[PDB]
């Protein structure tokens, strides 16, 4: 019916707790989302190329080249953590779960309305909203994962955070093979490096459209749309961090001399001269056993070549990294590769009052110890001998390749089968919740990008448009662009989200950290006197856990 | 659809009269409520502060300063006597009532109707409204008592008490918590006393959100809302008065020597010696047995410090007080400290066609004799010589601390174990019906602005909003406000409330007070010519009851 | 008037004059709703005589407050009657290395704002001619007895029917848990000690 | 202490639930609190005075 | 005891261990210890 | 221990252990013993103390 409504809106977060201390968390969400039809009915194929950019030498990392398919359909995508939780429900989970699971998903588009802008032919402009109650909307769900996965908080673009404001679909578009080469240059080198667009591979092509794939459903201003409870399969997620180093595995040395007062400078003293020490080393060509010698079960962690590009078919891209770096937790000037940065606009965070293009952004120093300091490394020879000559030592400070700035750190990789690592920690509000499994034969043990990762689906993408509303003029042989009347849909979008938590427990005599309003940061969590509204970033895995 | 009504009008007010004399009150009201779509969409936190006015040195009571979240949310409020009867059933009530009983309160919305303000740019001024067969109205009942409680009868922001003229909702708003220090002077105090507004506690940051606590239901013109029946478990309210001070408790003196002869002058007399009768008093050291020294079983009233205003983190705020003054019932001047006053506009009661902003007040003088009359009081030495000595007795002539217009009692508190005091009276039309029981560990034993208090929970408040109606310019990413199509809503609001009383019984040999229609109130009940109606205030405990 | 631009230096206001104001108050003898005078359902704490003595059989004892002070939660300084000191040794919290008789002791300073600040009271004459004048108006500046130091706020009590109020805070670790009801005909409504 | 406080019918004592302390020592300080009995000769007083 | 709920946007007051009071909570070198106050009533709650 | 149980109830238990040391008493016998810090009152205004 025109004027009966279809649905209702839900914006509550409801905890159900449950026997052995299981919390049932239903995150419900509710957003009006605002469509305009489509600039071009037509799937168009185009192609970036920024050669003026990378054409200055030394500036290669600043490729942008790429084809890509544009279709005339619209996005919804909700894979964002602040789409479903706001800061105070973020602190109940994070300061009391300890780990967490995703359950079910669904979605649903309700109270379609559909209106036309009849402009006046008045000489001061001016616009009447009609309602178009023939009017349709396009809905396609593609339940069977038939087209590409694309995550729309990669770019920042999901649904907005604000229940109360509206939001925007993403309009849909993705990458269609091309081949690319770009030969690395810097500032002082002669002539022009090799960059050409070679074209596209017949063998790779692939065109994708919904309207072949997908069952379309047609909405009237009175119909209403539902996905069905999608149910996931993922693992469980750790809302805690692990402390522990290499250094800190296993029973400490037994100090045979503990000290007498109080005070820093009153240390304890293992005793024993190191050459003369009991233990199990690694190194079969030496008696000293230390810290840094002793045997440990495994690694924790990994050094790999950061900063360092390689180049494929489509060009170059950053090889990623798993965890972040070291030190950077007590000086933020040291947050290097391994830290994500995060740049959203104002629906995602940044002051909805703020004026400008500039993006908000942020770098997530992850609490977890697992990442490097690459500076304190050294490699040294097989004999040992200490204290180690400048021959016999490769140090950070060393140049590789002629290269003053450029250390055996930067191309070094120590990833290996004792290596042991943990997986991404949740980003509040702009991080991923889930991401698609990749359908290679053998599989990574990780994503950077979100801490559940689908093994065998995750929910279909859901597409909106606005069907084409012709005018009398339409004529197919035509060469020109469809002649269509303006129009533009607003529809109601629910989703409800189903996570399984466990509530921590103390282990210890000391308390733990957990997230909470201080007065620094007591205005970022309520309006300004011109309702401007701002969601800063918050940690996931404050408490802390033993990692062996 | 859209041409089929979805409820009935009804605002009749039954008796149905059940055994042992107990009369079930059913108060039906209906009313056209008007709405508007709120000024923004976001929520904002305003600080208010008068400081201007406070800066004058001696007017610290007027402080206006507060912290308060306005919302894009509207209150229908018909927690008022005048909202559910008319002066007809209110004589009816107390006239021939002696106690009431709150029972059940449900309330339903129906008949919505949306409608767009298309103005047009013809040069001469014009705007044409057109029916929105899909806009929506956004309704949510807080059935948990989340939201702050906010009783709109403390602002005469209530529905009319016209069952014939359109109402209006009053926006919703609620107090963020602040600090705030006002050190009182007094015209002639040198210098500037502190007066700061000092911030917000994070401790007590407090952000409430309608669409992140309660279900939101949307309403085309089709749908309708009804809330459900609850049910009260509230103290019963006597409609009756107590007249007994102390002096007229228990079993009067003998008199030994009645007069002979009727006249205004010819007095009793008790005939013995005051320091030869017998009884019992609680002074110890006295021989007197008197009317003003005879133990009485107990203390009627209390009293107060009357206009003393204490200050917290908020600020200053008058000491309540239960009982009303003492005089003021034959000297209206004298009306004070206690007796409420109530000021209010032509939706509730002031004459609907008198001009200019100043409201129409009035002062209840409760008919309840529980009151103080502080210039009567004194204190005298425990000594108890008699004729007291100007050096022995303390009496409201005397300064306290130099100041010649303040007297003891202004200082002076007797509530104690022995106290007993009566709940307010109702306050026809403007008083509130039910109030909300404070959520602290020890409760007050009353409350000054509603007879009904409310034990566990009592109906949550109904919020409506217009839904947003956007047009095909919107842009989230922008800073500016939303671009709406300028919308509003008409809705008939039709709520049932149920007493229960009792009829009272002639106890004694003389008539009792009524409420009567009379030569000098005729014309308040009836409307003029050019259509003006009012509703006078009329007092509700008419009937005496005794004491003991 | 609600503001146009951001910043604590842009306030709003109610726009409508004091004395032409809508509302309910309990002073029928003035036409000015403020936020001061405003009728409010009942009173959050209570005034009550602060470091009062009263004397009995067994001799003086200080008279205890089931509410803390106000503004100590900005200034410790302030920190004052109502707000209990816990004074504890060695086995109980203090540090089991420290040496010396002097116990480790801390003020409990209550996140609840039931208290009240007696510099901020202020008593008028039933008049409520403003701006009030030096005679018609009793200040915590103003001495009672001709004492500088004590001002009408160290005698008052405000406790009456409308008064609300909360049970004492646990205090970790150092406070009592439970504690026996008084063997009273009439029992006190809570007990300082113990929640 | 002995307070007296004023209404409608008039002034009355304010009545206290406690009595006075130190009285039990000395009957001379008892006072506001310790309530005085009157009474003749039919409940009490000697029948013959 | 009941675990409390999400009642508004934003996050309320929690304890937590900082640099601050961190050495408050564990033993000394020659194993001194201590257990400094900690307040109860953190979160906020409507009145009315 | 923390126990959780239906609708956000937790039971918990709080198990506490000391290893208590009592000396015997200095004497068998129940004193009555009177304080009485006249010298410190003795100086006027110290009647708080």
């Given at each position: 019916g025109v004027g009966i409504s279809t649905g209702t809106f839900n914006n509550q977060t409801e905890f159900k707790f449950l026997e052995n201390g299981w919390v049932y968390i239903t995150a419900n969400s509710s957003r009006l989302v605002h469509l305009n039809m489509p600039e071009s009915e037509n799937y168009r194929r185009v192609v970036v190329n920024n050669l003026d950019k990378t054409a200055v030498n030394g500036n290669m990392a600043l490729d942008d080249t790429h084809a890509e398919i544009v279709t005339p359909w619209s996005l919804v995508d909700a894979n964002a953590w602040g789409v479903w939780?706001?800061?105070?429900?973020?602190?109940?989970i994070v300061n009391t779960m300890s780990e967490l699971h995703l359950v079910s998903f669904e979605q649903e588009i309700f109270n379609v309305v559909l209106k036309t802008v009849s402009e006046s032919a008045t000489q001061p402009p001016t616009k009447v909203y009609n309602n178009d109650l023939t009017a349709s909307l396009m809905v396609a769900l593609d339940s069977n994962n038939t087209m590409p996965f694309t995550p729309a908080a990669m770019r920042?673009?999901?649904?907005?955070?604000?229940?109360?404001?509206?939001?925007?679909?993403?309009?849909?578009?993705?990458?269609?093979?091309?081949?690319?080469?770009?030969?690395?240059?810097?500032?002082?080198?002669?002539?022009?490096?090799?960059?050409?667009?070679?074209?596209?591979?017949?063998?790779?092509?692939?065109?994708?459209?919904?309207?072949?794939?997908?069952?379309?459903?047609?909405?009237?201003?009175?119909?209403?749309?539902?996905?069905?409870?999608?149910?996931?399969?993922?693992?469980?997620?750790?809302?805690?961090?692990?402390?522990?180093?290499?250094?800190?595995?296993?029973?400490?040395?037994?100090?045979?001399?503990l000290p007498q007062s109080?005070?820093?400078?009153?240390?304890?003293?293992?005793?024993?001269?190191?050459?003369?020490?009991?233990?199990?080393?690694?190194?079969?060509?030496t008696n000293y056993i230390t810290e840094a010698t002793i045997m440990r079960p495994a690694e924790v962690g990994y050094s790999a070549p950061y900063y360092s590009f390689e180049a494929s078919t489509q060009g170059p891209f950053k090889t990623p990294i798993a965890a972040g770096r070291g030190g950077a937790q007590t000086d933020e000037n040291q947050a290097a590769d391994g830290d994500p940065r995060y740049a959203f606009g104002r629906q995602h965070g940044q002051k909805t009052t703020t004026t400008g293009e500039t993006p908000e952004r942020f770098t997530y120093i992850a609490h977890q110890d697992t990442g490097r300091y690459p500076e304190g490394d050294w490699i040294q020879n097989i004999n040992f001998n200490l204290p180690v000559t400048d021959d016999n030592v490769l140090l950070p400070t060393d140049p590789i390749g002629g290269k003053t700035g450029i250390n055996y750190t930067n191309i070094f990789n120590t990833y290996g089968p004792l290596t042991a690592l943990n997986n991404v920690p949740p980003v509040y509000p702009n991080g991923q919740i889930w991401d698609k499994e990749f359908d290679t034969d053998l599989k990574p043990r990780l994503h950077v990008n979100a801490p559940f990762v689908c093994q065998n689906n995750c929910p279909g993408q859901l597409f909106v448009?606005?069907?084409?509303?012709?005018?009398?003029?339409?004529?197919?042989?035509?060469?020109?662009n469809m002649s269509r009347i303006v129009t533009y849909s607003d529809f109601w979008w629910k989703g409800k989200l189903v996570f399984k938590a466990k509530l921590r427990a103390s282990h210890t005599w000391n308390p733990i950290q957990q997230m909470s309003i201080n007065v620094d940061n007591q205005f970022n969590y309520v309006p300004s006197n011109i309702g401007g509204m701002k969601i800063v970033y918050e940690k996931s895995q404050l408490a802390p856990r033993k990692l062996y």
């Open positions: 939780f706001n800061p105070g429900d973020w602190q109940l920042s673009e999901t649904l907005g955070f604000y229940p109360w404001k509206p939001t925007i679909p993403t309009p849909w578009r993705y990458y269609f093979q091309w081949d690319r080469t770009l030969i690395p240059s810097h500032t002082g080198t002669s002539g022009t490096p090799t960059n050409i667009y070679h074209g596209t591979d017949p063998d790779d092509v692939q065109f994708y459209t919904i309207e072949n794939s997908v069952p379309v459903h047609l909405l009237r201003t009175g119909d209403e749309f539902a996905t069905g409870t999608f149910f996931f399969d993922c693992k469980p997620c750790r809302l805690t961090h692990t402390w522990q180093t290499n250094r800190a595995l296993g029973l400490p040395p037994f100090l045979n001399s109080e005070g820093g400078t009153n240390f304890g003293y293992i005793g024993v001269q190191q050459d003369k020490r009991r233990g199990v080393t690694q190194m079969g060509n448009k606005v069907a084409p509303n012709l005018t009398n003029q339409y004529d197919p042989d035509a060469s020109a």
